Amino acid sequence: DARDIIKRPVVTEESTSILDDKKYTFEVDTRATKTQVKYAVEEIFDVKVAKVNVMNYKGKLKRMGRYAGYTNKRRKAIVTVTADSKEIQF
Amino acid sequence: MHVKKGDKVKVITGKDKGKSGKVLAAFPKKDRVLIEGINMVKKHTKPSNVNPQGGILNVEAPIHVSNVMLIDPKTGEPTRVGYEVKGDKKVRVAK
Amino acid sequence: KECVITGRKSRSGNKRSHAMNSSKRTWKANLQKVRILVNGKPKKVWVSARALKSGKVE
Amino acid sequence: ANDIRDLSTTEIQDQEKALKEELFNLRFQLATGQLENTARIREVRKAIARMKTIVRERE
Amino acid sequence: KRTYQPSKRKRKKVHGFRTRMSTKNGRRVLASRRRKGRKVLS
RNA sequence: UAGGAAGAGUAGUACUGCCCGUACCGCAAACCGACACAGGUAGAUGAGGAGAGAAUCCUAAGGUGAGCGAGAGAACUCUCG
RNA sequence: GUAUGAGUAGCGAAAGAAGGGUGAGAAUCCCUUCCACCGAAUAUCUAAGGUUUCCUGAGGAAGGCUCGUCCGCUCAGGGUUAGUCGGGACCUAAGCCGAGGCCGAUAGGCGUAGGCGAUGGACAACAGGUAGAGAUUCCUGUACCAGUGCUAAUUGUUUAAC
RNA sequence: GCUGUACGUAAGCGUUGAUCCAGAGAUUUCCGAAUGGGGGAACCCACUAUCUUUAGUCGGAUAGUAUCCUUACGUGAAUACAUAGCGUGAGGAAGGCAGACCCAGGGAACUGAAACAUCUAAGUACCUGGAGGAAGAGAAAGAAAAAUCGAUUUCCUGAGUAGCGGCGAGCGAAACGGAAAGAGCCCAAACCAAGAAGCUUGCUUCUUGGGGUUGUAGGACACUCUAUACGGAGUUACAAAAGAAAGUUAUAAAUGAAGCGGUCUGGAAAGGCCCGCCAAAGACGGUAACAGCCCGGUAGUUGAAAUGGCUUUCCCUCCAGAGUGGAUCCUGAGUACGGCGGAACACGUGAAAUUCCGUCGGAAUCCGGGAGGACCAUCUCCCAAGGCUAAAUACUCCCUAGUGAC
Ligand SMILES: [K+]
Ligand SMILES: [K+]
Ligand SMILES: [K+]
Ligand SMILES: [K+]
Ligand SMILES: [K+]
Ligand SMILES: [K+]
Ligand SMILES: [Mg+2]
Ligand SMILES: [Mg+2]
Ligand SMILES: [Mg+2]
Ligand SMILES: [Mg+2]
Ligand SMILES: [Mg+2]
Ligand SMILES: [Mg+2]
Ligand SMILES: [Mg+2]
Ligand SMILES: [Mg+2]
Ligand SMILES: [Mg+2]
Ligand SMILES: [Mg+2]
Ligand SMILES: [Mg+2]
Ligand SMILES: [Mg+2]
Ligand SMILES: [Mg+2]
Ligand SMILES: [Mg+2]
Ligand SMILES: [Mg+2]
Ligand SMILES: [Mg+2]
Ligand SMILES: [Mg+2]
């Protein structure tokens, strides 16, 4: 269920700035684990993963007039690969 | 709806009474029909990604279905409609 | 708390006085905790003196 | 779907895997801004649904 | 000082769902709040 | 010690190491006080001269110039001399 | 709902000034320089609590007791990286729950084993960089704890290395 | 034609039949009785098995693992057989609601009495437990009286009567009568049979089958006659659990008459004027203004693949019942009653029957026993201390169609 653990990449200026150091920012299932993410990325892209970082984000409050609600709860992994491996592209 | 896209149509009531036209669109969620040359109306359109010149545009608006009557493409005259089964295919019938 | 045989137990009524003042009280049963055979084996159970004066084996 | 029922319980799961790969690539393209056709998402997702469904039906 | 001096732990262990559902008379509170239809039970 | 025991520990290697929190305020305009409220809010650090001293006066590093102003300088009220 | 008082009381302890700049507009925003205030604090950390108030870019309707080109305001995008920090998968205290059990009109009350429960005990990483936003987390170096396999030696076989 | 409210832009699907509607299925994260253990709700940490990945750690799938009750089985202490206990398996429950209706347990006060205590308010409010679609009650140990009636319940009356009551305030029936609705049954016991347990030791005393259930007394037991599926009954009691078919209905729908009539006003005609028409269809709503003839539709007539219900048929299941005798035997025991203390009956201890609770005592059992408002006799009516039972009654979170001098 690699394709279900790894939902999306996180395309932002921070992320792109960080890609040159062979680090990849993925958005992931909130129940995933660091180790699952490791083996899933290794599966899905045939890279070697050295280290995997992960943070959890609360949902931000937004409005559209009379109607408030929190954006979805996010979990952002930052995989990094062994230097002697092939890159994930974006 | 007793009137369908692609039909030829007469207008019963309204300011455009007596006129005729094709059915360019239908809205059964509202029981309205979009008919050529009927209920032409002037939209004051600021320029945007399309209509980037902008302007006052004459275009057709919808009018209700009950104000409208179908025309038999063989006679060319207006006909109230019934339904019959040809073989195993329901169809529309003039009367 | 109730007799295992005829399930008699605390019921409730009034305590009346001279002057017929009504107050509230309970009539408890004379339940004694003694052995009997509930089944082919024994057990130490609340049982009532009424039920005990003849017919049940300790 | 009728075309889908002609498959013997493993080709069906292989197509499921393939559709999962395709869907991941589409979510990736979309997150990157590179996807022109957005309605292929629903189509692939519903194909997956049908395959899991007929698998269970045979089970 | 003043009378509300907050604490999450105290709040939940007094007024929280498990404290309500531990007690016969706290399940009535929840039955009564579901009966009014409140968005929030505790 | 009771026990279990056919595998045991030594060195060097390479690899592996989960979940939650981590922003920001935090003597404060973000906490408790209905307020951008002269109130209250635990602990670690907390320099110099003179000094017993964390007192006091002036100050260092560092923070601030406090969310209405200017200008007349009259009785009365307040705080001061 | 609107008056009256009434353009009245009040505008919430405190030192500002000028020059440049931005801008439709400046006592009020930005910069500079002098000046002044705190300094066992009016500084630096950090709990609890609050929960995005943080950063960036636009904005000035309302909020801000004035003003506003600004904000803890509004929009939109971003931002919180841990084997070693703190809490769990480690321990328990007061207390709480409590199989069975003892009590008791019911409902339930007490309570053993057992288990939860820190404000305590145990437990292995330090110094620098980080020009928008995190740092014992990331990066650079140098390490430590626990385990695993691969090699290379050594040892042990049922009066039994471990 | 469509991708909801919800515009928007983008991208797309649809007569090789979409969107939509109906039926049945599948999927159904985490929490919650929540049940693998914990827990501050929607979070955390696991074990055991099989498989899988890794060079191997690390990691991943899937299944099971709560407590209690009953029931079997196996283990198993002091203690010697054994029981307790422990474990496993097969069932079952747990919790919620409709702030409604009812059954029980427990049970106020304000108030009223122009104070107030008996009394009232009131067995109300409230707590709790049990439920079920109704519940409760119920097939006479009855109601009654010169005459009988024949299970309960609900309604009208009786009646604001009889009566209760600091005889104050106030509480207040029942039966006859008339109606709705209707329905009757099962055990216990003697007695026969088997089995096991005591050897109660030639007797009991427990588990099942038959038998039998009631008041002019009935039954067992003796005989005669029938009866073994001839016929009958049934899951609404009288035993219980299934299955088909047919029809009907509900949950989608289809068809469905007749004016584009002319003219006037008008932004627009459904309105005014003049002509017609349909009607088993002049319900409603909509449409540029008040439409039977514009639209959806209505009356009417049709139709349902699938599922659900109901009514019939079949299957299936299961079924001794009259008579005459009456040697003998049985017919609900720590109850029925009584004393004491309380309560419910309209009935406040009152002359206090009747019913119930607690505690003491404590019957006869068929030449017997109860009731008829203390009680006695006579007469009359009836068989308790065991159980089941639809309908008529009460209520409405809900569904469908509809109504309102709201
Ligand atoms: K000092
Ligand atoms: K601590
Ligand atoms: K009943
Ligand atoms: K009408
Ligand atoms: K009496
Ligand atoms: K009688
Ligand atoms: Mg972390
Ligand atoms: Mg910080
Ligand atoms: Mg000020
Ligand atoms: Mg004045
Ligand atoms: Mg003033
Ligand atoms: Mg000081
Ligand atoms: Mg800011
Ligand atoms: Mg302002
Ligand atoms: Mg703990
Ligand atoms: Mg920072
Ligand atoms: Mg009074
Ligand atoms: Mg009008
Ligand atoms: Mg009597
Ligand atoms: Mg008495
Ligand atoms: Mg009474
Ligand atoms: Mg008595
Ligand atoms: Mg008499």
UniProtKB/Swiss-Prot annotation, chain A:
Species whose genome carries this gene: Listeria monocytogenes serovar 1/2a (strain ATCC BAA-679 / EGD-e)
GO terms of molecular function: rRNA binding; structural constituent of ribosome
UniProt cross-references to HAMAP family, sorted A to Z: Ribosomal_uL23_B
Family: Belongs to the universal ribosomal protein uL23 family.
Name under which the protein is recorded: Large ribosomal subunit protein uL23
Quaternary context: Part of the 50S ribosomal subunit. Contacts protein L29, and trigger factor when it is bound to the ribosome.
Domain of life, source organism: Bacteria
Any one Gene Ontology cellular component term annotated for this protein: cytosolic large ribosomal subunit
GO BP, sorted A to Z: translation
Keyword RNA-binding recorded: yes
Keywords: Ribonucleoprotein, Ribosomal protein, RNA-binding, rRNA-binding
InterPro entries per the UniProt record, alphabetical: Nucleotide-bd_a/b_plait_sf (IPR012677), Ribosomal_uL23-like (IPR013025), Ribosomal_uL23/eL15/eS24_sf (IPR012678)
Job description of the protein: One of the early assembly proteins it binds 23S rRNA. One of the proteins that surrounds the polypeptide exit tunnel on the outside of the ribosome. Forms the main docking site for trigger factor binding to the ribosome.
Swiss-Prot record, chain B:
Bridged cysteine pairs (disulfide): none
Pfam family of the protein (one): ribosomal_L24
InterPro entries reported for this sequence: KOW, Rib_uL2_dom2, Ribosomal_uL24, Ribosomal_uL24_CS, Ribosomal_uL24_KOW, Translation_prot_SH3-like_sf
UniProt GO molecular function: rRNA binding; structural constituent of ribosome
Alphabetized Gene3D superfamilies for the sequence: 2.30.30.30
One Gene Ontology cellular component: cytosolic large ribosomal subunit
Keywords: Ribonucleoprotein, Ribosomal protein, RNA-binding, rRNA-binding
PROSITE patterns documented for this protein: RIBOSOMAL_L24
GO biological process, one term: translation
Top-level taxon of the source organism: Bacteria
Sequence similarity: Belongs to the universal ribosomal protein uL24 family.
Subunit-level organization: Part of the 50S ribosomal subunit.
General function of this protein: One of two assembly initiator proteins, it binds directly to the 5'-end of the 23S rRNA, where it nucleates assembly of the 50S subunit. One of the proteins that surrounds the polypeptide exit tunnel on the outside of the subunit.
Protein's UniProt name: Large ribosomal subunit protein uL24
Native source organism of the sequence: Listeria monocytogenes serovar 1/2a (strain ATCC BAA-679 / EGD-e)
Taxonomic lineage of the native organism: Bacteria, Bacillati, Bacillota, Bacilli, Bacillales
UniProtKB/Swiss-Prot annotation, chain C:
Alphabetized Pfam families for the sequence: Ribosomal_L28 (PF00830)
Domain of life: Bacteria
Location of region: Disordered: 1-25
Entry keywords, A to Z: Ribonucleoprotein, Ribosomal protein
Listed GO CC annotations: ribonucleoprotein complex; ribosome
Residues annotated as transmembrane: none
A GO MF term: structural constituent of ribosome
GO biological process annotation, one example: translation
Biased composition (Basic residues): 8-18
Similarity comment: family membership: Belongs to the bacterial ribosomal protein bL28 family.
PANTHER family named in the record: 50S RIBOSOMAL PROTEIN L28, LARGE RIBOSOMAL SUBUNIT PROTEIN BL28A
NCBIfam families cross-referenced by the UniProt entry: L28
Record's protein name: Large ribosomal subunit protein bL28
Gene (UniProt): rpmB
UniProtKB/Swiss-Prot annotation, chain D:
Entries under Pfam families matching the protein: Ribosomal_L29
Molecular functions (GO terms): structural constituent of ribosome
Entry keyword annotation includes Nucleotide-binding: no
Superkingdom assignment: Bacteria
Keywords noted in UniProt: Ribonucleoprotein, Ribosomal protein
InterPro entries noted in UniProt: Ribosomal_protein_uL29, Ribosomal_uL29, Ribosomal_uL29_CS, Ribosomal_uL29_sf
BP terms from Gene Ontology: translation
GO cellular component, one term: cytosolic large ribosomal subunit
Family affiliation: Belongs to the universal ribosomal protein uL29 family.
Name of the protein in its database record: Large ribosomal subunit protein uL29
Organism taxonomic ancestry: Bacteria, Bacillati, Bacillota, Bacilli, Bacillales
Gene name linked to the record: rpmC
